[PDB]
Write a protein that binds this ligand. Structure first.
Ligand code: MG
Ligand code: MG
Ligand code: MG
Ligand code: MG
Ligand code: MG
Ligand code: MG
Ligand code: MG
Ligand code: MG
Lengths: 385, 385, 385, 385
């Protein structure tokens, strides 16, 4: 189960680079140099890395220090063959963003947030990124009167519209992906799920430039079914990027390695991404637990990719099994894919077999055979088939 | 705190009519005749009632029994002055709907579900309803292989598109509202939150005919902030109807009387509906607990309306208080309402005060004063101001 | 992965017998005769069955009908070799129990609840049950003033003490197990978790007669770690019985077949039960989904036992793997099992290597190697080792 | 609603002193000197302060620096009249505790954790504390194989037993209180709720020395009813201390000011503490949001005490209202307080009115009148009575 760059596995610099500072504890690991993370990830078989502006260029750096940080980084990409498919902006760490970036109540902060974003979009394009992610982690509230949400959504639309005007006027080939999260670090965060972000995009001036970047653990912090949410994003044509990790239920954002947390949900997610032909990066937004030393960091990163490849094999064996194909027909998955009324409304209204003469008790008695289908899926996941 | 019909309080026949059968227990109350519910609700000050087809006309009735059920009902509306602003279809109780109505795997069930819906739309229009609600309570799955969600969303879009073609071809003045719920009775339900339903509507053929009917307790079953979700529906222009009740956190759907459950969320909800000028029905989808006899049923229904009027008074006193208006300015709510960059992109890019010369430490040190604002809101809610 | 009666798999009559009535829907399956369930479960390899009084003898039966129901049942046990290891009382279905049985506010209901329980204890002993379960599903409240919880706990202690006096005065060899659940059907249920039930038992007059009967899905409805809760019950010597099933997070009680829901938690549970030598029944309290016909019922029941045996094999391979044994030592699980200070308090206080001369930075730098250990466990679960 | 020291309101130095560092953001406020917090809290009307060892004496201080830190602190207590009713140990911040203190897998860490605790117990006694709290925030796991929980509970019992032997051998008048939390910062924390901690205490060598210190928000992170959990702790005689704050549901630990979060639960909590005559400190373990400057910190602290006094007044008016006293009798709260069977088992068994002649349908038809009672409680809370 050996990854290669063709598997398109990517990692944020902030993932393997997390020093282990949590709300109750100091860092347990020293800082990693971005150049060393690139080299170690290349050796594990990764395809590329992603970054926030402040992961790569320390906040407050002079333009001359900035050029030197970028030069060293680009040399490590050249040395390794690693790509940079995605970048994003840190609009959450510095105290100035304590009430948000794009939806801060203070107008001057909002203007600053936009300039900081636009500067990094230029750098992202220079490094070859195709997707620019926005995670509005400070956009939200702990109390009801602090944030008029209609005005805040106006400000959010204004900010994304301005970013769209900027990339189109520069002729940049880059698209935006919104990363939802329901809460943490704010008490409630605006656009809290996949669905809210999809709905918001449809009110932007150029909707074709925006999609979503859903994260496994974030939809599970609302108790939602992550493969279902991804299916709706694929259906809408909006799955531009994805963040893979693990989460044990409704609690703080754990960012466990992918495959930990809800294992059956990981299986159904991989089944869907592979069936649907998702061709974007398989990106891991995860945190090696702060119990670990650096050997544990790299073992945790390797585990992310290993678990994806094991689940990919098991999902492919499931779909290819003639006995499963039979069970899918027994459960009428084929009939779900056929139109309800391609004959049209008037024919439906005239069809007495659809109502006047429909035998409701005979249809009701038909079992769906879902439990046998699900146990076949369990046997495949466990290698008992 | 006396309600009158001008307050537009409405109730489903299934609310005060709930007999108290739960998954573990038999009914504790006898069935109510719809005519007696209309009369008792009118005496309490309600404005009108709502119904599922099967609440008013027992499933399986002949067309002659159907006419008699409707005639009696219409006579009680005439006798009382009660309106029927909304109706909906029962596509969840009968065993034929065990895998869904519009997204059942069996095609013949889906056709039946549409015919059953269209029949009730005609009746709804005849009784004067302006909103037709769809709650897809059986649309979903307990296991991952049972439902291909992309195909199911195709079937869901097909069904709503056909309903839109029907009302437009009949010239009916009625609009549709989707009522989301994340789970129960299915393990996961399709379109599980406000956001997912809003996003789905934008892919329908005639989006202007569809909005949402959010319910307090359902968004709280995903741990989401219900006033925030309503703000996004208002922002999108899609709040066609609302279901008011109470819920204590993430658990089974309690449908407590409005004001029970999360009381501060009820306060902020009423503040928003009244501030924004929502003019639709204030509809209660609630269940008097099965501990209660019929006197407890009517006390519970009266409590719904009482609690709305108390919270309406407290929210109005809050917004009118000069000290609160001062605090809103101290917290820069006024600045949230002003455009970030009405001067445009190029001027933003040339504005050195937005970045090169922006004093990030001075802006960071400014307190938001949200805790003082929130305690003013608490004092108002509690009548300590 | 074939079960036999030696595996001690048991099922409630109410599990495979669930007709599929949920809060929103009518039954989808006809009632099963208890004699046919016994026969079909024996053919699948089960060891025995369990029952509520009202599952076996319809509520309200005459003493003569009661004897006939029991005789037929005992003949099916004789015909099959099936055992009855556990029984329990239905104190939740009939409307008289709408505010509880042992903690109903009405004293006459509480007396009735005790007499109904004592009658079934006699029958349980006659059928050979060794454990008598109490699930206080109606003991609780939807509102804060309805139940003084200190008085209710006095009533709960009174009821269990009286049951203890009854079995000791009759010379019965039977023990009691309390089954916790946090909510549903009441808004909050008294003794909501394993921990609350363990603490309560220690205040009973004869604590040695009472233990717990935890259920997978119920502790997961509070977001708790079920194998951790079972470890604490084993540590206290109180794991008298267990209910096995599956649950997807914090929501209504799903009672999915065992192995569905949180699969990794099922693996760690089986590891613990087998390591610790739990010798009681492996009881499944589950509901075949109401999508299923009777063939799906028996496939779902068979899946419960299959998944236990697969996980038993994988947990045994994990613990027996020399590479895992090495990793357990790398993670210092051996050191966790050794006393912190068998040398005693005074020696600890005099030990300068414990504080004055303890090198806190060297100890802090040691990685725990938990991620490598956890990936070995993942590889074993998935059959990738 | 003015607090005075007689109200026994206390605050941790770490509460108003929280600098606002969260998992995603740097500190927004400078550090406060413990002497200035004592002075400002005294001016607001507080009764006293609490501390972790490392809040008062910076980690790593020499014995000479330690004496100077304590001297300054004691002078501010003398200057203000502020008391120190409780103290506790920081066994979570330093990296050495990354796998726990009392249940760390490494034995040398566990020994160090005990010595660090014993040193602070001596200081606590010198400052007059009567309660010593233990919050085992690092005791737990992110993965199933990392922690054998039976061995860990042996280590936890060993540590608390050694602390009990120490205080008894020194003749100290101090008692221990365990503070449960279900998760955060570990994936699952050992003794996760009130109930688990109560059960654990009963297995200690000297159980009379240990009680619980429950926190509002922590039981609500498991979706549990906090006033119910406090009632069980009072019933067991184990409520030694309490942490008051606010939480909005199942998510990260918010530590909002008391009265925020679940307001009705705050009302029922105050009702119970005052009814039962709890005489310990009313301690606030809360975090002023990092949006706030120092003026917001003190407004947030003042709000904690204000909201307690408002709810105390409303709960007292509720219980004193003759109409509520009538409703309590209508709901048979008086009958809940009377013994089920003070006549004894044999008389219960001979009482035909308890079963053979009990009219189950007449008892079932009696309404509980809980909704009217709950609306009276709502009217009192809102000042509408
Ligand atoms: Mg995350
Ligand atoms: Mg992410
Ligand atoms: Mg509901
Ligand atoms: Mg509703
Ligand atoms: Mg259950
Ligand atoms: Mg059970
Ligand atoms: Mg807390
Ligand atoms: Mg605390």
């Amino acid at each position: 189960y050996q990854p290669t760059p063709e598997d398109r596995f990517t990692f944020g610099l902030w993932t393997v680079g997390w020093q282990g500072r949590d709300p109750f504890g100091d860092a347990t690991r020293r800082a990693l140099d971005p150049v060393e993370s690139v080299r170690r990830l290349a050796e594990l078989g990764a395809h590329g890395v992603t970054f926030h502006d402040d992961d790569l260029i320390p906040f407050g750096s002079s333009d001359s220090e900035r050029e030197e940080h970028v030069k060293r980084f680009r040399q490590a990409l050249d040395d390794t063959g690693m790509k940079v498919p995605m970048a994003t902006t840190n609009l959450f760490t510095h105290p100035v963003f304590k009430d948000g970036g794009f939806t801060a109540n203070d107008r001057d902060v909002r203007r600053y947030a936009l300039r900081k974003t636009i500067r990094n979009i230029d750098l992202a394009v220079e490094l070859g990124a195709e997707t620019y992610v926005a995670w509005g982690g400070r956009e939200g509230a702990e109390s009801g009167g602090a944030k008029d949400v209609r005005d805040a959504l106006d400000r959010m639309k204004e900010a994304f519209d301005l970013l769209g005007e900027y990339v189109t006027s520069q002729g940049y080939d880059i698209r935006f992906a919104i990363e939802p999260k329901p809460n943490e670090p704010r008490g409630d965060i605006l656009l809290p799920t996949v669905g809210h972000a999809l709905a918001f995009i449809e009110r932007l001036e150029r909707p074709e430039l925006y999609g979503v970047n859903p994260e496994v653990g974030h939809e599970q912090m609302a108790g939602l079914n992550f493969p279902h949410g991804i299916a709706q994003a694929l259906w809408a044509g909006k799955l531009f990027h994805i963040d893979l990790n693990g989460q044990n239920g409704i609690k703080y954002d754990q960012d466990l390695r992918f495959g930990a947390g809800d294992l059956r949900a990981a299986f159904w997610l991989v089944d869907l991404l592979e069936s649907a032909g998702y061709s974007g990066p398989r990106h891991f937004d995860f945190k090696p637990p702060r119990t670990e030393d650096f050997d544990g960091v790299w073992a945790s990163a390797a585990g992310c990719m290993r678990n994806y490849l094991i689940l990919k094999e098991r999902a492919a064996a499931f779909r290819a099994d003639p006995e499963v194909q039979e069970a899918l027909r027994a459960s009428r998955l084929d009939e779900l894919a056929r139109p309800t009324a391609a004959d049209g409304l008037q024919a439906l209204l005239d069809d007495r077999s659809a109502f006047e003469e429909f035998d409701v008790d005979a249809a009701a008695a038909r079992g769906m055979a879902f439990e046998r289908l699900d146990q076949l899926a369990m046997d495949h996941l466990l290698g008992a088939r």
